């Protein structure tokens, strides 16, 4: 507080200072004061002329200010799930803010807002408690992902779900006794309320799981109610949604809550898109709930490498709840004895001897030949490579921008665990241990490079170095699998798993080595402009040291140097222009015929590939990227001056030479 | 004539008035003082005659262990003076101070949708090094550029 007043003594003691000196603590250290607010300018603070709305609940709402509020609250909490903080998204709603601080009115006579709207608001708050303590589970990042700060609010932790299930079922037995006595276009609005209540009673059964059948029958209900809700959203025209946004909505509610950061003015998406996000929520929560049928330990490893190959990055609640559903699996033992998950991946892939690993108890036998003679190497390799497979499971619940740089930080740890694996394998790059950790090392490199392309950080005059490096690690990984599936010590169940994994890689390599032939074709027809500054040697030495920086420091696989990758392009730039077309027309034809022979082939009678590996829509997305890329190589074969372009369709991994 | 000036302390009150109006990021007054009270020989100011057409603000520390890293903190020009050739002899004058003092990398973060100042930095030799998911407080991502001189 402040008791003695010195204002005149302050404004003549600061005006006697020097030009740019500060009277601060000796331990103030100006780096600390760079997150401070500057209270009197906008975009720093938010308390300039607030006037907190005087909500005045004592007023009956018709059945159109109820349906418009039911759509404004759902569109408010579905954009807290995708970013924006709880203040100025959901607490700005003046009904949620009245509870997170019976009915709404004090003079309780139970009008049609306490019977209908009040059990809805109680369920949105109760849904935002089950979601909120999933956000605090430590599987995401606190500001890149969700802003999960609860502004000293209480989301009804002591409200029983039995009382909430009876208030909310009573609202459906009240509305169904009034559909029959209203008209023909009001009745339409009440049956649009009745679907928004039964969407909230179905979303609530997804958040508390409590079984596995009633959370899939509820996810099949969300996908049916949303098309019937999204067409009756255009009933609240323009002036009911304006006369309740100034009466029951306070957009500046940050001006009375605890500030942790300046006002993040995140642009809203609307009511039509926020119901699409519930269809997006229910569509990939159905994918994660299929990870209870994974009947092996190599399928668990690949379900998380296909999950990061999605082209949508589902939702922070859906991502962070993958870690809770992939440990509780009852087919592999994660989160208690997790070193039996690493040994089960190696017993399947290459096979362990029967005097070293007992698969009926999933542990190393205590006193054997190897584990007692070479003691501190076996206990060192097992501890080092468990902290990679368990770490790789923690990385799938990440945004693709930090999934990548958590794989880059993992490459100095696979390099250690590969070095003390091929030193143990002489005491039994082949063998049981070092042939799986090399496969994990090579799948990590292919996911670093492919996600560096889909993040659009290889500007298009730098494709031909990327597509020459990418099919050099595809070529090493392909002659490593077929050298391992040609062995005699590998088990015959995973001899036909490698040659199914090798036919998938052969279809991906043949469609990415067809883009090296297409970029060189487009760079000489000036469809891809090669600018004047890139032909500097001190600049292209920094282009290569910035992208392929982790891959150069490795010695296994052999890195493709810059002076070596420039001899692949130069040996391919001295073809003719009408000869590069017919050479790229055969590389996508061979990639089209090899992609349809995988997505229609069986590939699921094997136990441990990944049965849900076509539902990520990756192998069929770059099947359309080699069909529509093939209908314009015929146009280009007629005239070499056709006005084609490289488009960047956002639902696709690869760009395509598309226009006319 | 447009000259580049090595930042005396008189241009601080104009730097805050310019950068606050065209850079969508909320800096306070003690953010500029963190870069210019410790590294004042890396920031430059461009004048028309005496008129303050834009400025650049930089720093140069040792990043983690030994990599001496320059960092272009913020750069803007008034809207009436863009396109002419200012802020490429203003930021090149800042790229020469942190090259003769021996930096081994020069990084900067720019917005993803901001195209007029991400096709500008590629003209100087910078290329995209990382992508930062929802870096700024608009939900917009950011690219991290780098140059190895």
């Amino acid at each position: 507080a402040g008791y003695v007043d010195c204002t005149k003594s302050y404004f003549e003691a600061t005006k006697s200072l020097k030009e740019e000196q500060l009277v601060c603590d000796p331990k103030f250290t100006l780096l600390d004061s760079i997150s401070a607010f500057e209270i009197m300018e906008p975009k720093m603070d938010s308390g300039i002329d607030y006037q907190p709305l005087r909500v005045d609940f004592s007023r009956d709402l018709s059945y159109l200010e109820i349906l418009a509020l039911m759509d404004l609250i759902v569109s408010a909490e579905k954009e807290w799930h995708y970013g924006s903080p709880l203040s100025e998204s959901l607490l700005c709603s003046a009904h949620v803010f009245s509870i997170c601080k019976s009915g709404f009115s004090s003079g309780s006579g139970r009008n049609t807002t306490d019977i209908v709207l009040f059990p809805f608001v109680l369920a949105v708050i109760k849904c935002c408690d089950i979601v909120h303590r999933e956000f605090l589970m430590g599987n995401l990042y606190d500001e890149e992902d969700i802003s999960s700060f609860s502004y000293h609010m209480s989301f009804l932790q002591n409200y029983p779900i039995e009382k909430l299930n009876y208030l909310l079922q009573s609202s459906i037995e009240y509305l169904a006794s009034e559909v029959i006595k209203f008209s023909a276009e009001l009745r339409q609005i009440i049956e649009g309320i009745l679907n928004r209540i039964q969407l909230r009673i179905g979303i609530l059964r997804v958040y508390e799981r409590s079984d596995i059948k009633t959370t899939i029958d509820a996810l099949h209900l969300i996908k049916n109610l949303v098309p019937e809700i999204q067409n009756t959203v255009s009933v609240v025209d323009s002036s009911i949604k304006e006369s309740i946004l100034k009466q029951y909505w306070d957009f500046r509610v940050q001006a009375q809550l605890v500030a942790t950061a300046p006002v993040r003015n995140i642009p809203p998406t609307g009511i039509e898109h926020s119901y699409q996000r519930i269809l997006y929520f229910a569509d990939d929560m159905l994918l994660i709930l299929n990870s209870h049928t994974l009947a092996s330990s190599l399928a668990v490893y690949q379900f998380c490498l296909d999950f990061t190959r999605l082209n949508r990055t589902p939702e922070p609640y859906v991502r962070s709840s993958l870690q809770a559903l992939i440990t509780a699996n009852n087919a592999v033992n994660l989160r208690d004895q997790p070193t039996s998950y690493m040994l089960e991946c190696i017993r399947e892939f290459s096979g362990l001897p029967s005097n070293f690993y007992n698969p009926n108890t999933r542990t190393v036998i205590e006193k054997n030949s190897i584990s007692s003679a070479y003691g501190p190497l076996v206990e060192s390799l097992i501890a080092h490579s468990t902290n990679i497979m368990v770490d790789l499971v923690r990385i799938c619940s990440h945004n693709p921008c930090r999934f990548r740089r958590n794989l880059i930080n993992l490459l100095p740890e696979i390099t250690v665990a590969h070095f003390e694996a091929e030193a143990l394998d002489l005491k039994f790059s082949n063998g049981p241990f070092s042939s799986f950790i090399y496969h994990v090392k090579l799948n990590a490199i292919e996911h670093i490079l492919l996600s560096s392309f889909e993040q659009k950080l290889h500007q298009p005059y730098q494709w031909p170095h990327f597509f020459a490096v990418l099919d050099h690690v595809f070529s090493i990984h392909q002659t490593h699998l077929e050298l391992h599936g040609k062995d005699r010590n590998t088990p015959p169940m995973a001899k036909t798993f490698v040659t199914y994994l090798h036919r998938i890689l052969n279809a991906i390599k043949e469609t990415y080595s067809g883009y090296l032939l297409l970029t060189v074709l487009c760079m000489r027809l000036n469809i891809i402009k090669t600018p004047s500054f890139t032909l500097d040697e001190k600049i292209q030495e920094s282009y290569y040291m910035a992208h392929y920086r982790p891959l150069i420091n490795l010695r296994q696989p052999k890195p493709l140097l810059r002076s070596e990758a420039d001899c692949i392009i130069k040996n391919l730039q001295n073809f003719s222009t009408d000869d590069l077309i017919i050479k790229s027309n055969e590389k996508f034809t061979a990639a089209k015929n090899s992609l349809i022979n995988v997505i229609k082939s069986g590939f699921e009678q094997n136990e441990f590939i990944n049965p849900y590996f076509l539902q990520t829509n990756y192998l069929k997305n770059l099947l359309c990227c080699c069909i529509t890329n093939l209908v314009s190589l015929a146009i280009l074969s007629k005239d070499h001056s056709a006005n084609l372009k490289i488009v960047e369709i956002p639902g696709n991994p690869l760009p395509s030479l598309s226009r006319t | 004539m447009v000259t580049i000036v090595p930042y005396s302390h008189q241009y601080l009150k104009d730097i805050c008035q310019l950068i606050q109006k065209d850079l969508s990021e909320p800096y306070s007054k003690y953010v500029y003082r963190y870069f210019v009270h410790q590294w004042p020989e890396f920031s430059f100011v461009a004048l028309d005659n005496d008129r303050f057409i834009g400025a650049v603000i930089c720093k140069q520390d040792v990043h983690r262990g030994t990599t001496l890293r320059g960092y272009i903190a913020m750069l803007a020009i008034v809207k009436e003076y863009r396109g002419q050739g200012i802020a490429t002899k203003l930021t090149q004058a800042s790229l020469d101070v942190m090259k003769n003092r021996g930096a081994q990398e020069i990084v900067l973060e720019t917005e993803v949708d901001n195209e007029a100042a991400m096709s500008f930095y590629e003209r100087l030799g910078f290329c995209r090094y990382k992508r930062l998911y929802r870096y700024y407080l608009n939900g917009t991502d950011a690219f991290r550029y780098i140059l190895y001189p």
Partner: peptide, 4 residues
């Protein structure tokens, strides 16, 4: 622009 210096991010947060």
């Amino acid at each position: 622009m210096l991010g947060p």
